[PDB]
Design a binder for this molecule. Sequence first.
Ligand SMILES: O=C(CN1C[C@@H](C(=O)Nc2cncc3ccccc23)c2cc(Cl)ccc2C1=O)NC1CC1
Ligand SMILES: O=C(CN1C[C@@H](C(=O)Nc2cncc3ccccc23)c2cc(Cl)ccc2C1=O)NC1CC1
Ligand SMILES: [Cl-]
Lengths: 305, 305
Amino acid sequence: SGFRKMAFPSGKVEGCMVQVTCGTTTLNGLWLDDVVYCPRHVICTSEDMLNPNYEDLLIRKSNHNFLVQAGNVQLRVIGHSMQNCVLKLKVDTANPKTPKYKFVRIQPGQTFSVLACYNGSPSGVYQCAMRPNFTIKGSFLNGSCGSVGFNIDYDCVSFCYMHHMELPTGVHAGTDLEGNFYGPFVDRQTAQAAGTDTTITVNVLAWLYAAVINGDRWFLNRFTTTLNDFNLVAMKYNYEPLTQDHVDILGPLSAQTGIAVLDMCASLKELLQNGMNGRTILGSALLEDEFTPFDVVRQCSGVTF
Amino acid sequence: SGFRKMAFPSGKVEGCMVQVTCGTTTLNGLWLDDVVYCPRHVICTSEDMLNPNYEDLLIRKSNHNFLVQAGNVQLRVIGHSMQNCVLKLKVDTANPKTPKYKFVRIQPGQTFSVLACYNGSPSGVYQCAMRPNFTIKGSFLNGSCGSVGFNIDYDCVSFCYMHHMELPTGVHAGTDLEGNFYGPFVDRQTAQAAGTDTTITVNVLAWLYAAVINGDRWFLNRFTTTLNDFNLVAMKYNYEPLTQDHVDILGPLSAQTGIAVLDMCASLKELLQNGMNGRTILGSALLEDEFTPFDVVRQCSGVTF
Ligand SMILES: O=C(CN1C[C@@H](C(=O)Nc2cncc3ccccc23)c2cc(Cl)ccc2C1=O)NC1CC1
Ligand SMILES: O=C(CN1C[C@@H](C(=O)Nc2cncc3ccccc23)c2cc(Cl)ccc2C1=O)NC1CC1
Ligand SMILES: [Cl-]
């Protein structure tokens, strides 16, 4: 019993974290095989960040301008190149701790674990979701740039996020490991803002199924709804639309609890229109949307890595 | 910016998890140096769990009755002894992945990370707190016994909890790493129940200071309170009494934000009376009590927004 916001074990990723320094700027790097990946803004001064020409800034650097530290060992940089908003530093030593890995680009609603790092040293691990407005609600201070997000599939680490910046609302923006930003963001000190966010509907439904599995059933009702009527309701409350794909993905949870997906949608409709009435679900007075259907199945079945 | 329920990176603990088998029972063990620590109930059958005589069950075992598996390698047991409710299995190989460690017994209100394991394999990491009734609200399934709780302040792992059982309310009970239970619990299937739980007041106060540091003040008021009047009101909401020790511990956060501890106590009194009126504090509609004063200082910025 119990239901917690659970992150993947971070060990395979901790063995890849390094410290990257270019002049006065120090941030985190991800060392896989003989390459260290880090945000390309490591080459910028505070003035350069206002309007950087990254190719022009990079051409002026040599391999020895980049200091890479792995624990108490200095790595030798033998090459450097840029891919989108990510700098790739070729080093003379392959990481002996390189796990089996993939680089994957995730979609809004998908969750992942973040290993927050400072000076190439991991400080914490938390779970979060890619919001529909492509930001993440992380917990990051100065020096956290280069911290990565990931999932684990059996013994394979799928790297999906690298931290680049904090927006004025305190939320975070970053890229996939190929340097492509999530969202309409750019890597420079200029006016940028997160768009209006929405709630991840399929994830709220998965979390309601998790509450039922844990004995919380007060919100269940005798009613059902059509998919179209539910989306008309959900659109009124800034909820993301529920597609037939989402209904298919919730099938296993629906069979396990005996509550049809549109039956659980009628519970969610009533919760939006009337509130919780002083009650909580899994210790929360808000409808939680940072657990996917897969996370619920994994936590309620004990899958190991 | 941001404030998340953050666990310590689990890598140092993942390298210590092993699978312990005694007959038909399989659970998790913690391998440090040449000793594997696990719950003593691994020697029990389901027919022994009501009134087990552990000394009598243990004397009938030899070293070769204990099967210890570390990854795909079978460890050789060369000794066994019981210390309180933990079994200590001496093995012929010291763990090469043994981190710098300590065994610490924690007090109610203290937080720690849990690395949930099944069959000696880590499945997830979450943060939690020792409740005032000595239980923990974990997320554990059958086979999770022997999973450990820990803190990693600096480079040293302080092991503080080993999981033993789930109570009828779905909450969990366990021991320190010397096998002494937290709370009035015994490792028997006899009728046992968690006492009425309370909210960890010093932790809610620390979390209100974290909200101020991150830029939020809507909940403050022009009032102060005596420590005695605050406790008379707090106890009516099932809040733990706030001692002078707690007021002293909140001193650094009080100096950083400019809000005296008894002024923050007045704001908490008003919050308990009024609720949140549709507002949230750090993304929550409930008052959070699983962040200690020390956790807030570790996670938050040193500069108040
Ligand atoms: O004032 C600045 C300067 N700051 C630097 C850096 C950046 O955002 N870094 C950070 C990341 N994550 C958390 C942080 C917490 C506190 C301070 C900096 C953080 C950046 C990176 C990029 Cl790609 C574009 C612009 C900026 C940019 O403005 N800080 C941001 C907060 C406001
Ligand atoms: O049905 C039982 C049998 N069960 C076995 C075991 C125990 O509590 N194991 C477990 C731990 N953590 C989470 C679990 C989740 C589901 C099932 C077992 C779990 C135990 C250990 C000890 Cl030391 C004392 C009593 C018991 C004991 O009653 N109790 C469970 C239903 C709550
Ligand atoms: Cl303590």
